[PDB]
């Protein structure tokens, strides 16, 4: 029995940028008021976790990263009403406090209690529940899922179907929901439209799934790695193009292919140049372009505002625009009801102890999602 | 008496950038097939016309500028079906061909036959109807309203109510429609929202009118010329701010005043820095910013795409997003029914011969719209 007690468990600690994770024992404090301690069952490797390693994303180190996961509630703090010990849960890297101006807005999801904008790497109360070799370790996005056990604020956890397969539905914690919502909710892709998707990783494939679900007639996948094209076509891409095969800039190729510009474009990579290319390739009068990728910290892009004056719309979103705690349980229910598939995103299933091997598969281009199992 | 004949008349010819207009005789050819020759009655001075003088806006010179106007059809070429001699008309600087993919789209208005994106300074057929001193003179946006007579393509003219007061409704040909539509159609301002309007000239006042019509609860006018504030409050601003009064950047001031960002912001000036400031000041998760001002030719802005990733929407539009030929007669009918006011925009009236005085008024900061009478 662990409730009310410090847990000693295994976690993947990142002590400094550009080094492997260290798999070692940590101490996990019991949950305080309005906090939930979760035994992890499965976590995905998202490129955003790799951004912490590479320094593309700046967050306080040392840290327990991981934000795409599912597990089972081990214990609850005083005052928790929304989950109970034994419940299957997905941690929410975008919280839903329910009280801020964003949470009350019909179309906002980027709750003001988030730890993304200006990361502290703590619990809501400004402290950490993790120690390692006598040192305090930072949280990541209020989730920290690269651990056998984590502690999250109640506003950062959702209860899901007790019959959920956690090794699949962990992807609803980030990559599936982000891509699918970016198409269906943020862009609001229309029936019969032409879409261009830049980046055919886990998130870009989920964008394709959403564009197909919304009835797009043409879905053009764009990637510099042609090994990504077969799976993109399997989930709905009608064409794939590699910019490296062309003498012309790819915005010009895509404008020609679409007879004057695409209806909807998506940047799902994290590069400044592809964000401007993706905007430019949407039709100048009525096109919509959605930024999904995360680029290098503190870098500005350059663009000509005439691209917007003609009528284009440029937007971005976190987590597909979904209000996280309302949406995650519904997405799992929809998966259980066979409304979408997750298997196409899962290329590799490894034990947690092989986290570093899982990151190497991502960095080499081999994998889409590796699921780590505890 | 003039049908089929060259008309000699006075026009304001711009021979060189950064020089006064030259009021002098020009020859105006009769209309060819699907062309309309108009006797001008009234034309407004829009800041975009001044951009041609300043070189902010690049169009071939020498040119007859002017794009905000109203007149009476003198004659029609072969095959014209939509207007007749003696009809009151407004030239359409954004055409509506009715046949291209943008004209067919429910939300497009930037018709592919426009002469704004890559100006040629011609009729649709690539030729000019104007001669001066024996030399061909460019058209501007297919309209060229700074002339006693002009010739336009049929897709660039709308028939309006025969009882229209042309000295007022000329403003529907650019500044009113642009500002009003930018609020009501492009931004889709909501009841009870907070808006910020950068630039309180004729277009920005028209944006305020639209925000007030849409039911905004707060409309914050922003201008470095505090002389503009009284009229902004008359048409609906709840408060005005001058950036020069503050130690902190105005995006910070507006975020504070709106308890975390505005719902809707509008750039109605034409500066790269205020386009980025206006984006920044809208709420990071659900705010919308609309670019209305014309940027300086070929210059790029610099911005951090994290402004969009959180959830902001950035867009621009020409002519308030209105499909021009469908919309202009309806806007005139609504003016006739007192659904909106134009007199607040009109600060000065001059004869056409005093065009240069009218530009001096705009450049000094004194005027909103000067209306020139032929
Ligand atoms: N907005 C959100 O809420 C959110 C959520 C999840 C992921 N992300 C970001 O989304 C991006 C994609 O994540 P992911 O799918 O896990 O990554 P991934 O699996 O690494 O996929 C990226 C893809 O981009 C391809 N690529 C790289 N450079 C180019 C190029 N120049 N042109 C075209 N294709 C290129 C690459 O080959 C790969 O297939 C990353 O920047 C993540 O950080 C954002
Ligand atoms: N998108 C379109 O279809 C369309 C239509 C009409 C006009 N325009 C453009 O819209 C802009 C406004 O036109 P207008 O109302 O005729 O011009 P205007 O009357 O010159 O008004 C511009 C206002 O901006 C104010 N201003 C200047 N600099 C700053 C600053 N740094 N901060 C705040 N205020 C400042 C200035 O004092 C003035 O009151 C111009 O760039 C036009 O070219 C665009
Ligand atoms: O992949 C989701 C994700 C994001 F979209 C970010 F913007 C971010 F900063 C982050 F850490 C993250 F995990
Ligand atoms: O004022 C309307 C207007 C514009 F919005 C432009 F973008 C432009 F190029 C132009 F010449 C113009 F007159
Ligand atoms: Zn909230
Ligand atoms: Zn992620
Ligand atoms: Zn058209
Ligand atoms: Zn204008």
In sequence order, the β-bridge partners of residue B131 are B27, B136
Q: What's the rounded Cα separation, in Å, for the pair B294 and B271?
A: 8
Q: CA-to-CA distance for B40 and B91, rounded, in angstroms?
A: 10
B291 and A309 within 8 Å at the Cβ level: the answer is yes
Q: Which of A52, A127, A139, A24 is nearest to A91 (CA)?
A: A139
Q: What Cα–Cα distance (Å) separates residue A203 from each residue in A133, A181, A336, B315? A: 36, 10, 20, 25
The verdict on the CB of residue A52 being under 6 Å from ligand 3 is no
Report chain A residues touching chain B, CB-CB < 8 A: 101-102, 105, 107-110, 112, 117, 259-260, 272, 275, 283-286, 291, 294-295, 298-306, 308-318, 321
Nearest CA owner, ligand 3 atom 13: A48
Q: What is the whole-number distance in angstroms between the Cα of residue A309 and the centre of ligand 7?
A: 17
For residue B284, with 0-12 CB atoms within 10 Å meaning exposed, 13-18 middle and 19 or more buried, which class applies? Answer: buried
For A193, name the nearest residue in chain B, comparing CA atoms only: B105
Q: Quick check: is A281 catalytic? A: no
Question: Coil, helix or strand for B69?
Answer: strand
Nearest-by-CA chain B residue for A313: B315
Question: C-alpha angle with apex A369: A365 to A374, nearest 5 degrees?
Answer: 125
- Asked if the Cβ–Cβ distance from B304 to A304 is below 8 Å, we say no
The environment of the single-atom ion ligand 7, i.e. residues with CB closer than 5 A, is B 97, 100, 103, 111
Distance from CA of A105 to the nearest CA of B (A): 8
> Residues 6 or more apart from B275 whose CB is under 8 A from it?
A305, B267, B291, B293, B295, B301
CA A149/CA A136 separation, integer angstroms: 16
CA distance A165 to B108: 45
Resolution in A: 1.2
A197, two tokens: 């998707």
Q: Catalytic annotation on A128?
A: no
Which atom of ligand 2 lies closest to the CA of B51?
43
Mutational pocket test of ligand 4: of B141, B201, B362, the residue with most ligand atoms within 8 Å of the beta carbon: B141
Per DSSP, helices labelled H in chain B are 47-54, 101-104, 166-169, 175-181, 202-213, 229-235, 250-257, 272-281, 306-309, 324-336, 355-364
Q: Three-state SS across chain A?
A: CCCCCCEEEEEEEECCCCCCCEEEEEEECCCCCCEEEEEEEEEECCHHHHHHHHCCCCCCCCECCCCCEEEEEEEECCCCCCCCCCCEEEECCCCCCCCCHHHHCCCCCCCCCCCCCCCCCCCCCCCCCEEECCEEEECCCCCCCCECEEEEEHHHEEECCCCCCHHHHHHHHCHHHHHHHHHHHHHCCCCCCEEEEECCCHHHHHHHHHHHHCCCCEEEEECCCHHHHHHHHHHCCCEEECHHHCCCCHHHHHHHHCCCCECEEEECCCCHHHHHHHHHHECCCCCEEEECCCCCCCCCEEECCHHHHCCCEEEECCHHHCCHHHHHHHHHHHHHCCCCCCHHHEEEEEEHHHHHHHHHHHHHCCCCEEEEEC
The answer to whether residue A174 is catalytic is: yes
Backbone φ/ψ region at B259: left (φ over 0), alpha (ψ -120 to 50), beta: left
Nearest-neighbour CA in chain B from A347: distance (Å)? 28
Check if B176 has its Cβ closer than 6 Å to any atom of ligand 4: no
Residues ≥6 apart with Cβ < 8 Å to A114: A94, A95, A141, A142, A318
Q: CA-to-CA distance for A83 and A106, rounded, in angstroms?
A: 25
In the annotation, is A9 catalytic? no
| Cα(A313)–Cα(B186) distance, integer angstroms | 10
Residue B72 gets which letter from DSSP? Answer: E
Residues 6+ apart with CB under 8 A from A175: A44, A46, A68, A202, A203, A206, A345, A369
- Rounded to a whole number of angstroms, the distance from the CA of B278 to the nearest CA of chain A is 13
Tokens of A211: 């564009």
Task: Check: CB of residue A21 under 8 Å from CB of residue A147.
Answer: no
B141 Cα to the center of ligand 4, angstroms: 8
Q: Which two tokens stand for residue B183?
A: 């609020």
C-beta of A67 in contact with ligand 3 (< 6 A): yes
**Which of B52, B60, B93, B138 maximizes ligand 4 atoms within 8 Å of its Cβ, making it the mutation to test the pocket?**
B93
Q: A54, A123, A17: which is closest to A294 by C-alpha?
A: A54
Catalytic residues of B: 46, 48, 51, 67, 174
Residue A185 Cβ < 6 Å to ligand 3: no
Answer yes or no: are the C-beta atoms of A89 and A158 closer than 8 Å: yes
Q: Which chain A residue's Cα is nearest to B110? A: A285
Taking CA–CA distances from B287, the nearest residue in chain A reads A108
CB contact under 8 A, B309 and A302: no
Of all atoms in ligand 3, which is nearest to the CA of residue A67? 13
Residues in contact with ligand 2 (CB, 6 Å cut-off): B 46-48, 51, 174-175, 178, 198-204, 222-225, 228, 243, 268-271, 274, 292-294, 318-319
- A132 phi and psi, to 5 degrees? -155, 120
> How close, in Å, is residue B78 to chain A by CA atoms?
31
Does residue B211 have a known ligand-binding role?
Answer: no
Place of tokens 């990783």: A201
Q: Are residues A260 and B301, on separate chains, in Cβ contact within 8 Å?
A: no
């Amino acid at each position: 029995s662990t409730a009310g007690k410090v847990i000693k468990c295994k976690a993947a600690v990142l002590w400094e940028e550009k080094k492997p994770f260290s798999i070692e024992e940590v101490e996990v404090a019991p949950p305080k008021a309005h906090e939930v301690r979760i035994k992890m069952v499965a976590t995905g490797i998202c490129r955003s976790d790799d951004h912490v390693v590479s320094g593309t994303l700046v967050t306080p180190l040392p840290v327990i990263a991981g934000h795409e996961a599912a597990g089972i509630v081990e214990s609850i703090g005083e005052g928790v009403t929304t989950v109970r010990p034994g419940d299957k849960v997905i941690p929410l890297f975008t919280p839903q406090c329910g009280k801020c101006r964003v949470c009350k807005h019909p179309e906002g999801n980027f709750c003001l209690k988030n730890d993304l904008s200006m990361p502290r790497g703590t619990m809501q109360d400004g402290t950490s529940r993790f120690t390692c070799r006598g040192k305090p370790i930072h949280h990541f996005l209020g989730t920290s899922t690269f651990s056998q056990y984590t502690v999250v604020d109640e506003i950062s956890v959702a209860k899901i179907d007790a019959a959920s397969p956690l090794e699949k539905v962990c992807l609803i914690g980030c990559g599936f929901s982000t891509g699918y919502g970016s198409a269906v909710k943020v862009a609001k892709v229309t029936q019969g439209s032409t879409c261009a998707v830049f980046g055919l990783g886990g998130v870009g494939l989920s964008v394709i799934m959403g564009c197909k679900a919304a009835g797009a007639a043409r879905i053009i996948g764009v990637d510099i790695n042609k090994d990504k094209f077969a799976k993109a076509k399997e989930v709905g891409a009608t064409e794939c193009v590699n910019p490296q095969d062309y003498k012309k800039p790819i915005q010009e190729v895509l404008t020609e292919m679409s007879n004057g510009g695409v209806d909807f474009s998506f940047e799902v990579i994290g590069r400044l140049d592809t964000m401007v290319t993706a905007l430019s390739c949407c039709q100048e009068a009525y096109g919509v372009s959605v930024i999904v990728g995360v680029p290098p910290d503190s870098q500005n892009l350059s663009m000509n505002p005439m691209l917007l004056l003609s009528g284009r719309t440029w937007k971005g979103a976190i987590f597909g625009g979904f209000k996280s705690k309302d949406s995650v349980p519904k997405l799992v229910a929809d998966f259980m009801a066979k409304k979408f598939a997750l298997d196409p995103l899962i290329t590799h299933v490894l034990p947690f102890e092989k986290i570093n091997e899982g990151f190497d598969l991502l960095r080499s281009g081999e994998s889409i999602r590796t699921i780590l199992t505890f």
